[PDB]
Symmetry: D2
Subunit: 186 residues, 4 copies
């Protein structure tokens, strides 16, 4: 899978998300060449780039113009983006113009996490998956509470990753920052 260092970043644009995390988001998302997925807060584009090649169509949304721009750049360098619709705009309004979805990945909550999830539940085909990524503490709580309030079966997994860096003196373990995945069962 495309390792972190292989992605073009940006100052005002966070990401890419740790490969280990991206790897797990895909395992939970349970892709498919016939699935329609939406990725909110596509940021650097990691999550979008991955899905761009395992489903029918992916809607990448992000209020920050730089993010939509940053994702596009990576999509182009990897020659992907055919089944990807970029959307410059607020998440709630961006979602309303989209068909029902099979997969839903919500990155940077954007302080609109609750409203964002509410909408997603109204457009979730049967057996749909909803995966919420969280970097902020307050975000994990809100993600559990809302998804629960919408009648979903919420689960949460915290991932503390450490990779080894080759030094002259030997190998050192470099830590990533904690990343929790709040998701709904099938």
């Amino acid at each position: 899978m495309i390792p972190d260092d292989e992605f073009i970043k940006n100052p005002s644009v966070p990401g890419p998300t740790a490969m280990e995390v991206r790897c797990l988001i895909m395992c939970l998302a349970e892709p498919g060449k016939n699935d329609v997925a939406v990725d909110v807060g596509c940021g650097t584009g990691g999550v979008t780039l991955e899905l761009a090649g395992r489903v029918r169509r992916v809607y990448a949304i992000d209020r920050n113009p730089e993010a939509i721009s940053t994702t596009e750049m990576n999509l182009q360098r990897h020659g992907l983006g055919d089944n990807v619709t970029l959307m410059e705009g607020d998440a709630p309004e961006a979602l309303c113009k989209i068909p029902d979805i099979d997969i839903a990945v919500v990155g940077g909550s954007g302080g609109e996490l609750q409203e964002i999830l509410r909408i997603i539940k109204d457009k979730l085909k049967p057996g749909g998956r909803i995966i919420v990524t969280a970097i902020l503490l307050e975000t994990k709580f809100e993600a559990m509470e809302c998804l629960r309030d919408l009648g979903f079966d919420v689960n949460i997994t915290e991932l503390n990753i450490a990779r080894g860096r080759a030094l002259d003196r030997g190998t050192m373990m470099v830590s990533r920052n904690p990343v929790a995945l709040i998701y709904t069962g099938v």
Copy 2:
């Protein structure tokens, strides 16, 4: 991906490998529908199940008869096990009778870690990957060194995981023991 709680267990068989680990093992290995893989120490059968439904033929090895049994039981539970050759017995003697592999996943060291890897290097098809899962401090070290000594490009990723357990009082974070993954380039 089959969640941990959906596996048939055995009071004498460890495992199955944490899902988050199973997931990352698959991202790294990058299974092809034409690859020949071997899983030393299949234990409960996690990794074996995951490879089974993605490659041509998987050779699942294990010293414990209960293991071969449990793995075979979880195989049938998901309509898989046609392209899986089970092997009871010591790894070294089992590995020598095997054809060349594209993917090598070695589970619990077994005290013969260094010998196992050695046998695998001479049986690895060009472009093959070797992945070692370690829970023991010493196994992590011996893997790194030995793989380097055999002329491979080694890397190590440690995963401390925490899952949420619903309690009356709320959600608790329960962690799994650290799992390191020592892998080679391609």
Copy 3:
């Protein structure tokens, strides 16, 4: 510092608090021989013990009768307790009957966290510290919010500890569950 395995553990009562966490608690508490401290949810009695041999007076509270007994037993085995006042009853009602404190440690709340902090803030001597342990996801968010909402500068440290366990096969890394410490500036 009294190591874990040296405490009388009652299966029904939680604890003792991982020695590593207890160490960090004392470091953040900055106990003085003239300080007055209260420990809500003393449980096994780990924290109470540490403070007992370091402050003027320690008020140990816990709504569980077995926790009080367990805490009393352990204190005796360590000749401590001569300057400790155990309390049988609910926290909130037990807090109003206590003098003002310099050090407040709060363990297992019980859905009464908000109220418990509200009382501790009112009885907190100037300069005093407030330290809250949280194993529940929710308690972490709640302690962070309530302490902030009560006008305190809040800080949070997550501890993921792994100790080594010698096995015939080698050294296994055994992980304790995550433990957070939410505290107010000194």
Copy 4:
């Protein structure tokens, strides 16, 4: 305890040791006002500083000339050093001119870990304590082996610490690199 940001950091000297780790080290070292201690690879002087205030004497050693300089700098800026014999040079040679030690803390091995531990065992007074800080994957293993081969009861604790950082968005957990502590039975 002296926090991280309160230390004079030199661009050529590593450290200071994370306050959470220093706290644990002081806990395992069980400092006594009579104990004679030695800090190998004092770095910024965090460990030396702490000890200087709780034991008879302290011999801070470090191959790096700038480290010695930076360590002597943090001593004065806190009113300590009247009992801190600084030493610039190779640890092994430096230790020979030192008295028998009660407490021994070793960090930077510079690749002479084994030679250092051996020397320490010959100078270790009964009831003495040895504590090694490992950052390199290889160091942990080596330390375990030597200490076992020297007739000591080895113990290892892996610490993964995360501190919360205040963002306009709210609160994120920032990870520190893993830090392992290999210690002998007192």
